[PDB]
Design an enzyme around this catalytic site. Structure first.
Site, short mmCIF file in Angstrom:
data_model
loop_
_atom_site.label_atom_id
_atom_site.label_comp_id
_atom_site.label_asym_id
_atom_site.label_seq_id
_atom_site.Cartn_x
_atom_site.Cartn_y
_atom_site.Cartn_z
N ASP A 130 0.81 -1.21 0.00
CA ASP A 130 0.00 0.00 0.00
C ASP A 130 0.85 1.26 0.00
O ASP A 130 0.56 2.21 0.75
CB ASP A 130 -0.92 0.00 1.22
CG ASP A 130 -2.13 0.89 1.05
OD1 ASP A 130 -2.34 1.44 -0.05
OD2 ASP A 130 -2.89 1.04 2.03
N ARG A 134 -0.26 8.90 1.31
CA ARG A 134 -1.18 8.88 2.48
C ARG A 134 -0.66 8.00 3.64
O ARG A 134 -1.07 8.18 4.78
CB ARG A 134 -2.61 8.44 2.07
CG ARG A 134 -2.65 7.05 1.47
CD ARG A 134 -4.07 6.49 1.23
NE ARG A 134 -3.93 5.24 0.48
CZ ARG A 134 -3.77 5.21 -0.84
NH1 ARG A 134 -3.77 6.36 -1.51
NH2 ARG A 134 -3.62 4.07 -1.50
N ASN A 135 0.24 7.05 3.32
CA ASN A 135 0.86 6.16 4.33
C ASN A 135 2.23 6.65 4.81
O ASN A 135 2.96 5.91 5.47
CB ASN A 135 1.00 4.74 3.79
CG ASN A 135 -0.15 3.85 4.20
OD1 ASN A 135 -0.63 3.05 3.39
ND2 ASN A 135 -0.60 3.97 5.45
N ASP A 148 1.89 1.87 7.70
CA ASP A 148 0.97 0.97 7.00
C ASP A 148 -0.30 0.91 7.86
O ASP A 148 -0.44 0.07 8.76
CB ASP A 148 1.62 -0.41 6.82
CG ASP A 148 0.76 -1.38 6.04
OD1 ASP A 148 -0.14 -0.95 5.28
OD2 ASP A 148 1.00 -2.60 6.17
C1 LIG Z 1 -0.17 -6.33 12.24
C2 LIG Z 1 0.62 -5.16 11.68
C3 LIG Z 1 -0.02 -3.99 11.30
C4 LIG Z 1 0.68 -2.90 10.79
C5 LIG Z 1 2.07 -2.99 10.71
N1 LIG Z 1 2.89 -1.97 10.20
N2 LIG Z 1 3.88 -2.23 9.24
C6 LIG Z 1 4.52 -1.12 8.98
C7 LIG Z 1 5.65 -1.02 7.99
C8 LIG Z 1 6.95 -1.31 8.73
C9 LIG Z 1 5.79 0.39 7.39
C10 LIG Z 1 5.45 -2.07 6.88
C11 LIG Z 1 3.94 -0.10 9.77
C12 LIG Z 1 2.94 -0.64 10.52
N3 LIG Z 1 2.10 -0.01 11.45
C13 LIG Z 1 1.71 1.28 11.40
O1 LIG Z 1 2.13 2.06 10.55
N4 LIG Z 1 0.86 1.66 12.38
C14 LIG Z 1 0.20 2.88 12.45
C15 LIG Z 1 0.47 4.13 11.97
C16 LIG Z 1 -0.66 4.92 12.25
C17 LIG Z 1 -0.91 6.38 11.95
O2 LIG Z 1 -0.13 7.22 12.78
C18 LIG Z 1 -0.20 8.57 12.62
C19 LIG Z 1 -1.08 9.18 11.71
C20 LIG Z 1 -1.07 10.57 11.59
C21 LIG Z 1 -0.20 11.31 12.38
N5 LIG Z 1 0.61 10.71 13.22
C22 LIG Z 1 0.64 9.38 13.37
N6 LIG Z 1 -1.57 4.16 12.81
N7 LIG Z 1 -1.06 2.89 12.91
C23 LIG Z 1 2.71 -4.16 11.13
C24 LIG Z 1 2.00 -5.24 11.62
#
Ligand SMILES: Cc1ccc(-n2[nH]c(C(C)(C)C)c/c2=N\C(=O)Nc2cc(COc3cccnc3)n[nH]2)cc1
Length: 259
Positions: A130, A134-135, A148
């Site tokens: 993805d 936006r990510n 993600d």
């Molecule tokens: C089960 C599972 C699920 C997700 C993941 N992965 N895998 C990754 C990789 C390393 C990039 C591939 C990231 C990730 N998790 C997240 O990015 N989590 C996250 C980010 C946010 C938004 O945060 C904000 C938004 C706006 C402002 N400030 C903060 N919410 N949740 C791994 C395992």
């Protein structure tokens, strides 16, 4: 992390498992840290609770300067996953707001930062699926972080996807390379949506016939060339992220020299 040290403020969005809240975490040092607090509906299955929590179990391990950061976890009900919050928000909207002041050097910087994160994922044979602006979140003007957190999901955005992903739902590191070049097009276009002039259903037709996203006005020619290599129909002809880092670092230095 004690619950009394987390204060929730306003809904950030809805995630797959429950609402996500903006909050403030006061750490052991006493400093206040902006956090995104992710929640899970109480009535979910054990499997879904496991999936929800698995994010914190995985992300505890990620410490890359261009990957988002997990602050912590409160396991006791209500179970909260506490991610770092980046007040600048998503890169797409950041770019939109700042189009008149951002330099091309900085656009290439962001591309290379994300490329480095992806090379790290490639090294462990993980796929993102993805990759889109936006990510990506802006930690500061000098630093972006890949996340993600879109509502589809350790491992549809048709206008970002490789032909094999569209045709077969095949997703490999090579298909991430294709998506990453679309992400670079978004960056160099200050947040424009790729193929905004088409409907999703028209995209494959266009790709099959050899058409591609046109070079953004500000995109260096050599960078557009790299983009077009990432958009080779044949996944085997696209560069590895590992080697793309080298190619992008060269573009960055060429751009830095001329600046
Ligand atoms: C089960 C599972 C699920 C997700 C993941 N992965 N895998 C990754 C990789 C390393 C990039 C591939 C990231 C990730 N998790 C997240 O990015 N989590 C996250 C980010 C946010 C938004 O945060 C904000 C938004 C706006 C402002 N400030 C903060 N919410 N949740 C791994 C395992």
């Amino acid at each position: 992390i004690a619950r009394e040290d987390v204060v929730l403020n306003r809904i950030l969005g809805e995630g797959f498992f429950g609402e996500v809240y903006e909050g403030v975490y006061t750490n052991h040092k006493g400093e206040k840290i902006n956090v995104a607090v992710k929640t899970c509906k109480k009535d979910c299955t054990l499997d879904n609770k496991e999936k929800f929590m698995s994010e914190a179990v995985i992300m505890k391990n990620l410490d890359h300067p261009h990957i988002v950061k997990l602050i912590g976890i409160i396991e006791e009900e209500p179970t909260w996953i506490i991610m770092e919050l980046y007040p600048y928000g998503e890169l797409g909207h950041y770019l939109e707001r700042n189009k008149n002041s951002l330099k091309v050097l900085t656009l290439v910087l962001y591309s290379l930062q994300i490329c480095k994160a992806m090379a790290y994922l490639e090294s462990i044979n993980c796929v993102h699926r993805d990759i889109a602006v936006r990510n990506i979140l802006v930690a500061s003007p000098e630093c972006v972080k890949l996340g993600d957190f879109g509502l589809s999901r350790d491992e549809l955005p048709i206008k970002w996807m490789s032909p094999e992903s569209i045709n077969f739902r095949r997703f490999t590191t090579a298909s991430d390379v294709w998506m990453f070049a679309v992400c670079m097009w978004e960056i160099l276009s200050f947040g424009k949506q790729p193929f905004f002039w088409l409907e999703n259903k028209d995209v494959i037709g266009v790709l099959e016939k050899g058409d591609r996203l046109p070079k953004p006005d500000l995109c260096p020619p050599v960078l557009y060339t790299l983009m077009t290599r990432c958009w080779d129909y044949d996944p085997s002809d696209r560069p590895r992220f590992t080697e793309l880092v080298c190619s992008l670092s060269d573009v960055y230095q060429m751009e830095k020299d001329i600046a």
